[PDB]
Design a protein around this motif. Sequence first.
Motif, mmCIF file in Angstrom:
data_model
loop_
_atom_site.group_PDB
_atom_site.id
_atom_site.type_symbol
_atom_site.label_atom_id
_atom_site.label_comp_id
_atom_site.label_asym_id
_atom_site.label_seq_id
_atom_site.Cartn_x
_atom_site.Cartn_y
_atom_site.Cartn_z
ATOM 1 N N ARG A 772 0.816 -1.220 0.000
ATOM 2 C CA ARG A 772 0.000 0.000 0.000
ATOM 3 C C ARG A 772 0.851 1.272 0.000
ATOM 4 O O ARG A 772 0.352 2.369 -0.266
ATOM 5 N N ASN A 775 4.057 3.721 -4.875
ATOM 6 C CA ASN A 775 3.566 4.867 -5.626
ATOM 7 C C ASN A 775 2.430 4.443 -6.556
ATOM 8 O O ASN A 775 2.506 3.389 -7.202
ATOM 9 N N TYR A 776 1.386 5.266 -6.620
ATOM 10 C CA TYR A 776 0.167 4.917 -7.363
ATOM 11 C C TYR A 776 0.406 4.560 -8.838
ATOM 12 O O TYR A 776 -0.256 3.676 -9.380
ATOM 13 N N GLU A 853 1.660 11.846 -14.582
ATOM 14 C CA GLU A 853 0.997 12.018 -13.295
ATOM 15 C C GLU A 853 -0.428 12.480 -13.578
ATOM 16 O O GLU A 853 -0.647 13.311 -14.461
ATOM 17 N N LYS A 859 -5.884 14.259 -8.294
ATOM 18 C CA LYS A 859 -4.847 13.374 -7.762
ATOM 19 C C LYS A 859 -5.093 12.990 -6.306
ATOM 20 O O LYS A 859 -5.069 11.806 -5.970
ATOM 21 N N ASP A 860 -5.324 13.986 -5.450
ATOM 22 C CA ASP A 860 -5.556 13.730 -4.028
ATOM 23 C C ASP A 860 -6.757 12.801 -3.804
ATOM 24 O O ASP A 860 -6.700 11.909 -2.957
ATOM 25 N N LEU A 863 -5.851 9.204 -4.970
ATOM 26 C CA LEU A 863 -5.033 8.601 -3.908
ATOM 27 C C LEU A 863 -5.859 8.163 -2.693
ATOM 28 O O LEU A 863 -5.645 7.075 -2.148
ATOM 29 N N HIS A 864 -6.807 9.004 -2.285
ATOM 30 C CA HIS A 864 -7.645 8.700 -1.130
ATOM 31 C C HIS A 864 -8.586 7.522 -1.383
ATOM 32 O O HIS A 864 -8.851 6.733 -0.475
ATOM 33 N N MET A 866 -8.347 5.097 -4.056
ATOM 34 C CA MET A 866 -7.737 3.919 -4.705
ATOM 35 C C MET A 866 -8.063 2.647 -3.955
ATOM 36 O O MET A 866 -7.836 2.568 -2.746
ATOM 37 N N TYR A 868 -6.893 -0.510 -3.032
ATOM 38 C CA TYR A 868 -5.715 -1.354 -2.882
ATOM 39 C C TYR A 868 -6.048 -2.848 -2.819
ATOM 40 O O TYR A 868 -5.310 -3.667 -3.357
#
Length: 901
Positions: A772, A775-776, A853, A859-860, A863-864, A866, A868
């Motif tokens: 986790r 990097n995304y 990117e 992006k934020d 990321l929040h 995603m 996993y």
Amino acid sequence: MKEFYLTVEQIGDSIFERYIDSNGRERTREVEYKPSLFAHCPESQATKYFDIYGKPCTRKLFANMRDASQWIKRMEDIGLEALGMDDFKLAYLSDTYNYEIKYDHTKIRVANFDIEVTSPDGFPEPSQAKHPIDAITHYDSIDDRFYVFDLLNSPYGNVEEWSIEIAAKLQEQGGDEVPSEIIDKIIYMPFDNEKELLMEYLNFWQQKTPVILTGWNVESFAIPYVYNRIKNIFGESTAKRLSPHRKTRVKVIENMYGSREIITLFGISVLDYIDLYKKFSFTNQPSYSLDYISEFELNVGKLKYDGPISKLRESNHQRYISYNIIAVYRVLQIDAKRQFINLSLDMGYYAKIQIQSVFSPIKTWDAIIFNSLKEQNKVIPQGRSHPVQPYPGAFVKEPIPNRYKYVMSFDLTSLYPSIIRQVNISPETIAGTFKVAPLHDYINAVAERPSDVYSCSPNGMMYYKDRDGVVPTEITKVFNQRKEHKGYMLAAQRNGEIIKEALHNPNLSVDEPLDVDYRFDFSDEIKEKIKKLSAKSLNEMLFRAQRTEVAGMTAQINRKALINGLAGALGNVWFRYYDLRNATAITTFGQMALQWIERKVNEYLNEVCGTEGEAFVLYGDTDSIYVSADKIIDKVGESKFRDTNHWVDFLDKFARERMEPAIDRGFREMCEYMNNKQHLMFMDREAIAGPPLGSKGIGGFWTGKKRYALNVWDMEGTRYAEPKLKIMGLETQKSSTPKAVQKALKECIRRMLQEGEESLQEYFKEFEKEFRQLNYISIASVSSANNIAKYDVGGFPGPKCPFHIRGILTYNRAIKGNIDAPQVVEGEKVYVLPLREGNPFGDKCIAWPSGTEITDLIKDDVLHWMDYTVLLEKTFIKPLEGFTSAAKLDYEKKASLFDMF
DNA sequence: TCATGTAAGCAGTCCGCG
DNA sequence: GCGGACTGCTTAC
Ligand SMILES: Nc1ncnc2c1ncn2[C@H]1C[C@H](O)[C@@H](COP(=O)(O)OP(=O)(O)OP(=O)(O)O)O1
Ligand SMILES: [Ca+2]
Ligand SMILES: [Ca+2]
Ligand SMILES: [Ca+2]
Ligand SMILES: [Ca+2]
Ligand SMILES: [Ca+2]
């Protein structure tokens, strides 16, 4: 010197040719070339021209090329074959250069360029060209100079001159790190207006007119943009000055789902480096941004800047220009390594085609065959229309999914070309047909012998044996070239392994790398000197050896591709020599050859082992077999071996001294059975695979057809310093698999093959715990993105919408109403991530342009949100479960009786 | 993805399967 | 939930 062409074009009734004369000077000429074509004639009419079947022809000489083309049309109206080369510039080259072309690359002007266009309202479309061109860097290979044209005054901002002094400085000094080796080669020209920039660029172009024009995406962006911008500002006549003959055409390139427009510049040969890379590199990359490819090829860092590219010029013009120059240089560096321009020139001049025709194996072979036949006063047949029809290909054995401890593979050299040569398969060598038995009857040698007169393939075709066909003759020449370069490639590979071995014990000294030719196996003297060298010098030699290996790879694999392309072209309806009888004759013979030798190898090993009906050949695909060597090792016993290298040597000797002679005997029998012209089925040992001696490694495993992994110690005579994983088809090898997941799966496989179950379990537990943090981008899947519009229904997924397309639609809604956000381009690649339930994007996944990117706006949130858990299950656990189940291993430790203690 | 061929794998959609 | 029919994508050869 001998003259050679640079470019050739037909413009109406004229051939326009740029060439290097006998004095090494570039010249241009217009020639009123009178072409000849042919018609069949009576046998009573004396002629020296015959078609490929031996039927006599009369030559028809035309007053001009238009008369010739018109005659072709009338012959179609009448219903009669119009024979001869209908592409008149190829006939012109054949007449003008009737000898093997020896070219001098130093006289050929190769231009590498890149342009910058500031655009505040999205991607600057080349068809519209509504924004100023604010930078051009144009490298000229003859001058060895970078010509930089810099726009200082624009409606999008006035800027100061670029400083070569700041450019040269380290990034840590506030500089741009323009490589020291090109600083002195930059010729910098600033302009206070775009009109003067473009007028001077055109005058420059006239003085230094590219012969080969390249760069990154130049065909789809730089060229059409420059042409259209000049056309918009000055008019059509000025834009056409980009052509040395002042002729251009807007050419429509059509694919399966839409079309695009490029500009054909008559008298220039455009070889876009992205297209060279895609054809000749034998990679499939997740992104084709120059930054991504430069990182992959050269290990150079990403060109870093702050903010969007549309604000880079106004915020940091210094960096803007430096990066434009560096971009041009990076393409030159990639070419210094890969040597695709060299390859294109080699192939183009060999075939006697326009250099840009190297992208087309059908054009390439049409020209090679035409030139070959013309030498014998033979006349090529007219191209005909054919419906596309499916036809059968290779045989692939279904393997039993399992671990396989010791494995030796064997492979036929250049299979399809060797079949063409062995059987004598050619348009003009067809002798007739015979009554076919089921394939298994030939494989098992129970079918009646097909012919006592002609050379046969088990598809029913028979061929003459008295003389080689043109296809066998010409394919042999390129095969022999390929063989030479492959020799150099493998020598460099073996030399690299010598250096790797020596690097275990480097000497504490100051010295220099040895001046050696890496294309030839190192002598004993060289080997002794290497053993005394410092790590610095050894690493430099390793780099040079590896660069030599890459050059050999380029030269050999693409010559292989060309000859394999001839076999394939026989099954393409646009090829002049299309014939499904010949296409199938090749593939069906291949099916027989593989299964015939499987039987022979099984028979041989059952004999030496004293068994009956046991399967030693565990797998085969097209032209290769994989043999279980467990029983061979067990016949001497593992405890008898000193180390891993010892049993590798033993298997190497067994394969060479026992198996290869048996294989040869088997194929010679098959050659006599099919009554072939020449025995050319040469099957040699490829890989020796197994676990390290004394370890718990499993050596290898198969999950299914085209899906396996082997721990290899020796490959085609290269004895590795360290064992190398040969992995085919598995997720580690797929560009769609996330980068970090490829890496993790590879390590899982390494552990299985080299160390065993417990080692695998340790690593899995760790990856699952830590992943986790990755990097995304490294955990994003990748896909090509076709037909976005087809599945778009009001911004939402329509019926049967693919997962990656759904992701793109999600992205499009998230960025909607913003002209600045990077748009996903139809047909290009995207990164894809799954999204957790209840996310604000309103769907289960999101996708964005690959190699980039994701935009800061979202992006934020990506990321929040995603997912996993889903990412891990889909890309890692599911494939790992496949590997371990096949190998009869567990990636998680099962409960045991010892747990009670 | 303008550009020689076929075999064949896996992801995912849609939907059956009592 | 798994598999077949189907699309899409991607490798191996
Ligand atoms: N790109 C391709 N186009 C058409 N046919 C191909 C291609 N790749 C492979 N084949 C067919 C023809 C080949 O002779 C056969 C076996 O391929 P492969 O084992 O990769 O190489 P090869 O036997 O031609 O050369 P090598 O000498 O390197 O083994 O499969
Ligand atoms: Ca740029
Ligand atoms: Ca082969
Ligand atoms: Ca080989
Ligand atoms: Ca040493
Ligand atoms: Ca092979």
